[PDB]
C-alpha cells in the first residue's frame with residue numbers, strides 16, 4: 001500500500017490532471033498526441049504550437065505515472081507508451097530493416113564538417129576523413145534481432161500543418177519532420193522545415209537534401225531521424241517511478257518497463273563521438289569504446305536509403321550539462337528490473353553515472369550554478385583546441401554547447417531540469433557526490449528567488465557567464481572554480497521553470513532537512529496556484545521579444561536553389577521566416593501580433609505549454625508525497 005500523501009497538494013495535482021486531460025481544453029490532438037502548447041502561434045524550440053516533441057511525450061509519461069500513484073489506475077501510463085511507440089519511434093515502415101541491416105559497424109558514417117554560419121551549408125561529405133568503429137551495434141542486433149533503432153525522433157508535425165504527410169503521401173498525420181541542420185548560428189527562425197522521409201517529392205529537385213549535404217553525385221532518396229537524448233532519459237526516469245508506485249499498490253506496468261529498458265539500451269549511442277573519434281584525440285579514428293565520452297550528448301542520428309540499401313548512425317561530440325540524467329543511469333545500471341538485455345548495457349550505464357557526476361562538478365561555478373559543457377570536436381571540425389582552454393578528459397570547455405542564437409546555456413531552465421535529476425538521485429541513494437553538488441547549488445538559487453507582497457514572484461530567467469572551470473583532474477576533484485562566474489541578466493515568472501525549481505528543492509529538502517529549501521518550494525507552489533490559475537491550468541502574460549524575427553529574419557538559401565513547400569510557398573534566396581510558412585497568416589493571433597509590431601511594441605502572449613503544465617502538476621504530486629504533513 002502506498003504511503004499517505006498530503007491531501008491539499010494531492011488535490012491540486014488531481015485538479016491539474018483534469019484540466020490537462022480535459023477534451024475541451026485542447027492539449028491533445030484527436031490521435032491522443034500532446035501538443036507543445038494549446039496556442040498555435042508559437043516559436044521558441046519548435047516553430048509551430050501544434051508540432052510535438054519527444055520532450056512532451058516524456059512529460060506525458062511523467063504526468064500519467066503520478067496519476068497512477070494517486071488513482072491506482074495505470075492504464076493512462078501504458079497508453080502514453082503506446083502512443084509514443086506508435087507515433088514517435090519510427091516503425092518498420094519508417095526505417096526499413098532492408099536498409100538498416102546493410103549498416104557497416106566498421107564505417108558508421110561519412111564525415112562532414114560543421115560551420116559557424118548557415119550560409120556555409122551545404123556541408124561537403126569527405127570519405128577521406130577518418131571515422132571510428134561502432135562497438136555497440138553488434139550487442140543490440142544480437143539482443144533484439146533487428147537493425148532498427150528503438151529511440152524517439154525528437155520533433156513531430158502532429159496535424160500535418162506543413163503538408164509533408166507520412167512517407168511523402170502529403171496527406172497523412174502525424175508527419176515526421178526535422179528542422180535544425182545548419183550549425184550553432186541557425187536559430188529556430190533560420191531553419192527550413194524538411195521531411196524525415198525524403199523521396200524528392202517536395203522542395204527542390206532532390207527534395208531538401210542538397211540544402212544541407214553535398215555529395216559527389218546525385219542525392220539518393222533517403223530517411224533520417226534525430227534523437228533528443230534528454231527526452232529518452234526522462235522517459236526512463238518516469239517509467240521507473242511508475243514501476244515503483246505500481247508495485248506499492250499491487251499493480252503492474254511490466255510491458256512499459258520493457259520498452260523503457262530497450263530505449264535505454266539504444267540511448268547509449270549518445271555516449272559516442274559523432275564520427276566515433278577517440279575522446280581527447282579527435283584526429284584519430286576510435287577502435288571502439290575509446291570513442292565513448294559516456295555522457296548524454298546533444299543527440300544521435302541515423303538514416304538510410306529508400307530506393308537503395310545502405311545506412312548510417314552518428315553520435316554527437318557536443319555535451320551540455322542540461323541533458324545529463326544521473327538518475328536514469330542509476331536505474332539502468334543498478335535496478336534488476338531495468339537491466340538492458342544487451343551484454344554491456346548495465347555496465348556502460350554504470351560508467352555513464354560516474355562520468356556524469358564528474359561532469360556536473362567540473363562545471364560548477366564559484367557561485368553554484370552549472371556552466372555549459374564540453375566538446376570533442378572544436379568548431380565541429382575536430383580543430384585544435386585553443387591554448388589556455390580548460391578541458392574535461394581531453395574535451396574543450398564550451399560556454400554555450402551546440403547553439404549560440406540564443407546561447408544554449410543562457411536559459412535558466414537548464415539549471416532546474418538537470419539538477420532535479422541529481423536531487424532524485426540524492427534522495428534515493430544519499431550519494432555523497434550529489435549532495436556536495438546540491439548543497440552549493442541550492443544555496444545559490446535560494447538567494448535568487450524573489451517573492452513580492454502582492455503574491456507574485458520572480459526567479460532567474462536569463463543568465464550569463466564569465467571565465468571557465470579549471471582543467472578537470474579526476475584524482476584532484478573540485479577546485480572550487482574561482483574564475484568561473486554566473487550572472488543573472490534578468491528575472492521573470494516562467495511557470496515551467498518555477499515548477500521544476502520547486503520539484504528540485506522538494507527532493508533536496510526531503511533528504512537534507514534544509515528548511516529554507518522546503519519553505520521556498522512550498523511558497524512557489526502556493527503562489528502559482530493562488531495567483532496564476534485559469535480554467536486550463538496556469539499561465540501568465542509574457543513578452544515575446546524575438547517575434548519581430550517573424551517578419552525581418554531572412555532565411556539562407558544557396559545561390560541557384562529553388563523549391564516549394566507543400567502548400568506552394570516558393571523557397572529561394574531572399575525569403576523571410578514567414579515567406580515559407582504563409583499559413584501562419586491564418587492563425588487567430590496573427591493580426592494581434594502584427595498590430596503590436598507595427599505600433600513598435602513587443603508582442604505578449606498568455607501561453608499554455610504542455611510540459612510546463614505537467615511540470616506544475618508533477619511538482620504538486622512530489623510535494624504531497626515527500627511532505628505528507
Ligand SMILES: O=C[C@H](O)[C@@H](O)[C@H](O[C@@H]1O[C@H](CO)[C@@H](O)[C@H](O)[C@H]1O)[C@H](O)CO
Nearest residue numbers: 044045055406410411413494496497609
Ligand atoms: O533559450 C530560451 C528558451 O528556448 C525559451 O524560449 C523557453 O523555451 C523552452 O526552451 C527549452 C530549451 O530549448 C525547450 O526544450 C522547451 O521546449 C521550450 O519551451 C521559454 O522561455 C519557455 O520556458
Ligand SMILES: [Ca+2]
Nearest residue numbers: 185186187405
Ligand atoms: Ca543566426
